[model samples]
Target: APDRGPRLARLAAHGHNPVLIPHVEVELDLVTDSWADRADPWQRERTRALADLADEAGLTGERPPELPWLPFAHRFFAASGRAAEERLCRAWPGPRGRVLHNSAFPTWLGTLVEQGFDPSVALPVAGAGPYAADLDLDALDVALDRYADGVSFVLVETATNAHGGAPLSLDNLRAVARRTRARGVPLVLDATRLLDNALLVTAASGRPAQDLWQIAEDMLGLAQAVTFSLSKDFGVDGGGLVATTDERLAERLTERMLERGREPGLSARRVLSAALLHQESTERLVTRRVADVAAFRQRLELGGVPLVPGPTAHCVLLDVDKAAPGTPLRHPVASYLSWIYAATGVRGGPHLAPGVRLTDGSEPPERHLIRLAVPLGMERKALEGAADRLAELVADPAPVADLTEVPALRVYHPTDALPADIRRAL
Candidate 1:
């Protein structure tokens, strides 16, 4: 939803093929409008109405009527992900409500905003600097000591993206859950990267976890609600799920989707359900990706580029100032991103986590954080060459194209970048 047009244009201009900026805004317009026309009683027929124009010689898949998701389509409005939504909602164990399978255009934060989550009420548990990205349980304790009754909910990102998707302590989440539960405050998780977070947590070892999904469920159990970006984590074409343990909240979210008609469409649900069946394969793909982020960070670290120290998240966050000490550059992490893209073709921050936050502070401070994540479509082996170019950029960022010269370079923009007031300082 943040401006990715600049990044897409830059990547395209440089011949970066097949960039899939994940999310389903398309779910809003075409999916709903086209489905409406097809579902109309008078003109109904999702099929082409062959009308004796038979392609008997292999024009079809040679398997007519092989389509499997037809029944669900007919039962629903043909514009719904209700069945697929239930399966995803049931992904969490124990008592649960229905799920909202809406587009990622309104992100987890955006969805919360629509649910009357005003920023002024939020008390960020993690603050000090962007460097203080990990959830500070003590900070929450201090706040709750005074403001516990005032809290509507407590939100936490598992393996906070503020610190480059670094894993947070499970005990930390369990502790926060305790505080929220005791105070009757809802616990929410921005779980866009939950699967990989669990994988990294297990890989980091020292856990009671067996596999990624087990740890994922363990974390899920700690929160009343959790959000997902199916496009990013599940390799789908946009749309996401907001799963909750509360029936009331689920009903409210459904009303929002119903009124807006932004629910995940037929194809989205089918593909989502299909992928859900191969969840073992999903974990395996996530495994390779987690490894990619780790190896990329290690390569940069070995080359003397400083990183946010701890376990890797969906990406790796590094301090450009620390990497090129004493170098007078404005937003060096951002400059390094541009330079690296110019040199290597891979956009430096492949869907970096949003820097804007809802915090307790009067002003959200800026930190020079460069989140290095691989594009989902990228080959694992390509990270090696990308890493080499990254090392070169840090070694000498003199080749950073002048912002004034290249119109695309006019702004040192992060992917999914948002303005301060709307994102934070809200």
Candidate 2:
């Protein structure tokens, strides 16, 4: 017998926070970890749980005959990347076809280039705020028009990562879908933080009775296909899925997967299968995190550090210059970071630099945006404490004469500071 209805019942009894890194502490210097250390028992269990949920969702490799359930997202992406390039070539068969992606994680861009596709970013308007990239349908339409026959597909992120986790509105998504369909250009969703986007959609929809999964499905249905990493939002160590309603494309994708030896292992499939049943539970935890992030945002406001003024998936972006303006502080942004970590054990650094070039030709302003990530299960007092320290730094007029000499300032330079892979991708 099939489990009837929306499958709202809690599949598991226990709740575990899978927010990872930002929620946990370690020496900032010890940046990298071995694969063996990463794919530990806890991760394995999490994967198993997600796979269990997938089975409950009836995603047990049963439905669409062509859609193959691959183990990890990167593999799924590799197959999709290859498949998209091939399909585009056959259709256009001209110079290497271009892919239009938002200002997302660099890996998305890198993967497209690696698959022999030229990539272009649909830039967001400055006044529209950070999340505007996903909402810029007009701008995207212009790009499609400009590229015309040269563009293969449009890959849009649910939330713009570079813009600080700002999500696109449902109306905006619908518009993009309509535009793409009219032009016959396939739209692929970068749904890594899909639940976050889903929550926002539900909140805006004002339908209390509608199931979240249903809302998520409706939103995803707008795209020709989707690529998601379970590790980010699903509380899983590793695994991702590429799925589509386009059966023919799915068949081609599966063929490419098989040819490249990128099939999911039995264990990977099992874990992803389990993940579906417990999605509601994961949603609840994410809800809590969202609120925690909101609380942090409120606290940051008291210190005059302007935030993007909404709920983000995990992190909040703080404009350092606006927070502490008119001060003759040299490297004030970097100094504040060092000071905060020294004052409180809350460690983070500047994410994007001031003059870094964007795909839109114009560079993001030197506003000194620093990302403050909300920990998985952080308490109220802890958040207030972190904010209080920042407030102190904001109020202090004196410069840290030895700020450059501070121990926490070891990796103060952006190039020297960021992870090697992130630097490489940028």
Candidate 3:
């Protein structure tokens, strides 16, 4: 959302396939409309729909309370908010109320832990995956039992970032929620990838897709709270958190906000507006775009390229090694993908986690995989062309003996050293 215009302009400049830009623009529209209208019915309706969908999906629990400011609205702004905060204690419904504003899950998670709730205790069913993959239930239980004060909140990203934009199935998500519910732990869904996820779920289940609000309802019912990023889904500049089933809890949380910090200019009229005004259009846009991504995957499959969980989400996982067996397994495919993207003019970030995050630490495990994102409104031919080019690239495989270690894995430091080293590596 932040850097799309320039990126898209660049994409269009080169002869690279430019199909997925529209989906992202439509998503942007949702943010624009929300910025104008502060108190639209869209928010309420969304929450209600979310709840109903959750119920239908059999994700059960008490209704959640509503919040005024999302991250600003955590159970901390007012008397009611303060009460909500107390309730968030690590123990199941520990204290009367305890709620914290949501940030990127990574940030929120760190804060929650700092507040004394152990991660293991809060999410006994959780595991660390690049995005969210093959959750280890038993390990999670061991961690919780060994470290938790009591059952607390359980937060998970439904459409995980890793796996080339793969999604966690609604059924799969529901199963986790149910487990949390059985243990009386509140479950929160980082539905940041909701739109993409909904489409995947619908296509896989043969059932009408459930909306974001519905997903919220299911998550809130199974857990105690629900949190997500408006910027990610709603494509807004702001974000907030809410608990519809427990309004009283929400009020208490608001009180806490007032006590700890400042207000007024912090208001998210824009976020609220997006949440309300663009709901309808966003839904339509998301639905259409998902179709396009699906189409892209189909084209690749027709061409005989290998994929993981094939065509389920916006991101595509091209098994470089599988596609090009002779290619060195240790090839830095993420970097290689970036190279192709640069040469072809595709605009998106590399999907390699440690390779990108761990600066000069160590060579990451060799998998020879790269990810391509299928934004929202990409054209079919463009998608096919990208797939085709990739197919061609993978056609020529280099053995490990022919490969060399990436320089990024060797240098560590800022300023004077990095620029020259990075430049040389590139």
Which regions of candidate 1 fall more than 4 Å away from where they truly are? Answer: 1-115, 121-134, 206-210, 255-262, 350-366, 375-377, 397-426
Best by TM-score: 2
356 in model 2: Cα distance from truth in Å?
10
Between candidates 2 and 3, name the one with more favorable lDDT.
2
lDDT of 3 at 277: 43
How does residue 139 of candidate 2 score in lDDT?
A: 74
The positional error of residue 200 in candidate 2, measured at the CA in angstroms, is 1.4
**Candidate 2, residue 252: lDDT:** 64
lDDT of 3 by residue, 58-113 (tens): 44221222422232233221112122223333213244223211122344445555
State the lDDT of candidate 1 residue by residue for 1-426, as single tens digits. 224465556544543321222212111111111121122231222122221122322232211122121111111111222222333332323333211111121233443444344333333434333224445665566666666355555666665554556666566667778877886767767666677678776776755433777777788878776555554454444444555667666565555556656445444445444444346545655777677777777877787668776556556666765766766554455555554544544444423334344454445555666655543333455666666756766687454432211221233333224576633422
Counting clashing residue pairs in each candidate, in order, gives 1, 18, 60
Once model 3 is optimally superposed onto the true structure by TM-score, how far is the C-alpha of residue 103 displaced, in angstroms? 16
Please write out the lDDT profile of model 2 over residues 205-285, one tens digit for every residue: 775423456666667878777776655555544555666656666666666565655434554555544543455656765
lDDT of each: 0.49, 0.55, 0.44
